[PDB]
């Protein structure tokens, strides 16, 4: 069996901390990269941020540019997703994906993601 | 390049006795997707074919 | 017309296909005078491959 959860999320106030967190089953973050994505209503999925697989370098969106920081455990196949700075608009509905395969490097356009998490909300309020 | 189109127009350059610049190509932003298969990106600086 | 030594034959070869491999140094320009008499040049080349 191969699914997928997610925690974190909810309601934090403007400017505060949020931290997102997700796991995977039947498949390891090391041999398969781990991508983010945030969708709004009436709207397509777009991207936020991932980490690469080598876990060398991350890469952030450009409205949340140098904010975030992602760190990830291999020994319990778990995510760590810290949000900083947090704005109303940053309000959407993210989810916890992996890549289709394991193959190296990172990919945040396009669906390359065949496996989707829960679609946990994020809002922001002041 | 301003030739860019579509699938359809398939294409192939060989190109040889060059020094690249992976590690620029690996770091840029304006690249939406860099996947790699068979080579870790780091790795693949080192190593070449 | 020009009454100077030029280039206006090429018969090297006749096609050229399938290119893997280029390289040309700097431009310039050789005297093609019809010189007579002993020679002032000797030129030695080794190829190994």
């Known amino acids: 069996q191969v699914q997928l959860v997610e925690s974190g999320g909810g309601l934090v106030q403007a400017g505060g901390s949020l931290r997102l967190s997700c796991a995977v089953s039947?498949?390891?973050?090391?041999?398969?990269?781990m991508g983010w994505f945030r969708q709004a209503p009436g709207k397509e999925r777009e991207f936020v941020a991932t980490?690469?697989?080598?876990?060398?370098?991350?890469l952030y969106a450009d409205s949340v540019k140098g904010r975030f920081t992602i760190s990830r455990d291999t020994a319990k196949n778990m995510v760590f997703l810290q949000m900083n700075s947090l704005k109303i608009e940053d309000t959407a509905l993210y989810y916890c994906?992996?890549?289709?395969?394991?193959?190296?490097?990172?990919?945040?356009?396009?669906?390359?993601?065949?496996?989707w998490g829960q679609g946990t909300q994020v809002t922001v309020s002041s | 390049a301003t030739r860019f189109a579509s699938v359809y127009a398939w294409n192939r350059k060989r190109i040889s006795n060059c020094v690249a610049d992976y590690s620029v190509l690996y770091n840029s932003a304006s690249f939406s997707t860099f996947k790699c298969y068979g080579v870790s990106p780091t790795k693949l600086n080192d190593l070449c074919f | 017309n020009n009454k100077s030594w030029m280039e206006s034959e090429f018969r090297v070869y006749s096609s050229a296909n399938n290119c893997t491999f280029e390289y040309v140094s700097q431009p310039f320009l050789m005297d093609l005078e019809g010189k007579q008499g002993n020679f002032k040049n000797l030129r030695e080349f080794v190829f190994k491959n």
């Open positions: 994906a992996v890549r289709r395969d394991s193959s190296w490097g990172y990919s945040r356009q396009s669906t390359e993601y065949d496996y």
């Open positions: 039947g498949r390891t973050i090391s041999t398969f990269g």
């Open positions: 980490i690469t697989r080598d876990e060398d370098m991350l």
